[PDB]
Amino acid sequence: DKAAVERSKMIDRNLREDGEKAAREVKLLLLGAGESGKSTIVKQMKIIHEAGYSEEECKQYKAVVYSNTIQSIIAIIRAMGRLKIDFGDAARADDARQLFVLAGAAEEGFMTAELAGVIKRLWKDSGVQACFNRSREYQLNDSAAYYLNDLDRIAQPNYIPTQQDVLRTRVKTTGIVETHFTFKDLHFKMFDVCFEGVTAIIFCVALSDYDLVLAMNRMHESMKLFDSICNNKWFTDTSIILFLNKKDLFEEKIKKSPLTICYPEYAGSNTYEEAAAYIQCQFEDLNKRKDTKEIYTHFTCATDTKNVQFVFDAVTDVIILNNLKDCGLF
Ligand SMILES: Nc1nc2c(ncn2[C@@H]2O[C@H](COP(=O)(O)OP(=O)(O)O)[C@@H](O)[C@H]2O)c(=O)[nH]1
């Protein structure tokens, strides 16, 4: 590849006693609005480039899986009230009450056969399903269906979270998180959040946000943020990578909700191909120097390890081709 040839032109290692063993460093910022997939990308770097989630590491997330699951079903049940949606079978009302009894007396996320039964019956009720499909009207974890559909597995007494279970978790990130990994002989220093000596920025956008935060919308907030970042002077020589993320969730809701909810002027078809393209153009068009800065856009599913590996391999080649000269040796 051209990236291997390009890096082979460097001579700065020759200036160093032990240059062939020096570490060339890459500083990478992860930016984007809340819930766009930043921490998930961080988890994937650990999985792909460093030690996987040991059986004991996964175990640590067990009560997070329960907590996320409990939160999800509760959001849907409470929404039924505000949106005036009745249960399919009126016996579910007792189960709804029982959900609040059990959650209300517990210390933290937990699972029992009794709770599992309550949640399972609620989740396969037609009215609950009707409310679920109107999730754009309220706030619901994107991993709700993932965990609730797999409730039987999760509820087993000897449950051990799989890697996907962990990637699917929602954990609140406060402050700045710095992770380190080595790939293609590059020592990445990755920061989950404006830094100056930044080699590359990966900006995450939740595509599936286009019909969310009704009461400008989520997608427009993300655009406003990208506009600011992409055009900042501090990032002139910084490679700007755009992850249009949650493409899996987007593909599913596109055939259900029209893009016009977000962009009223959109007149294309409501298909994945045309709507994804349109969003990509909306973001890329925010670049205020279309002759000195290129944006590198990828459609990602951050919870998909193989897709993130493929995409990050491509991002790495962009960095090697464009930024290697400003990357120091240590
Ligand atoms: N289905 C799906 N879920 C995702 C994707 N990316 C992130 N998530 C989930 O979305 C939730 C929030 O993601 P997170 O990485 O914590 O966002 P952050 O606030 O930017 O750090 C988590 O439950 C993730 O598992 C994706 O591409 N597809």
Jot down its keywords.
binds guanosine-5'-diphosphate, magnesium, 330 residues, GI Alpha 1, domain 2-like, alpha/beta, six-stranded mixed β-sheet, 6 strands, G-protein beta/gamma-subunit complex binding, membrane, Rossmann fold, 2 domains, globular
Q: Care to give the gist of this entry?
A:
The PDB classes it as hydrolase. The chain is α/β, with parallel strands linked by helices.
Question: If you had to describe this structure to a student in words, what would you say it looks like?
Answer:
It is classed as hydrolase. The entry lists the keywords GDP, hydrolase. The protein has helices spanning 2-8, 38-49, 55-59, 62-82, 92-105, 113-123, 126-132, 144-149, 151-155, 163-167, 218-230, 247-254, 272-284, 305-322, and strands spanning 24-32, 177-183, 186-192, 200-206, 239-245, 295-299. The protein has 330 residues and is α/β, with parallel strands linked by helices. It has two domains: 1-53 and 173-328, P-loop containing nucleotide triphosphate hydrolases (Rossmann fold), CATH 3.40.50; 54-172, GI Alpha 1, domain 2-like. Strand 2 (177-183) and strand 3 (186-192) form a beta hairpin. It binds guanosine-5'-diphosphate. Guanosine-5'-diphosphate (GDP) binds at residues 32, 34-40, 142-143, 167-170, 173, 204, 245-246, 248-249, 301-303.
Order of helices and strands: HEHHHHHHHHHEEEHEHHEH
Structural class by secondary-structure content: alpha/beta
CATH architecture of the largest domain: 3-Layer(aba) Sandwich
Q: How big is the Rg?
A: 23 Å
What is the topology, as strand order, of the major beta sheet?
2-3-1-4-5-6
The level-1 CATH class of the largest domain: Alpha Beta
**Count of beta strands:** 6
* Count, helices: 14
Helix content: 40-55%
Shape: globular
CATH topology of the largest domain: Rossmann fold
- Ends distance: 26 Å
CATH superfamily of the largest domain: P-loop containing nucleotide triphosphate hydrolases
Bound molecules: guanosine-5'-diphosphate
> Percent of residues in beta strands?
5-15%
Largest sheet: 6 strands, mixed
**Number of separate structural domains:** 2
PDB class: hydrolase
Keywords: Rossmann fold, GDP, Magnesium binding, hydrolase
Assembly: monomeric
Entry title: Crystal structure of the K345L variant of the Gi alpha1 subunit bound to GDP
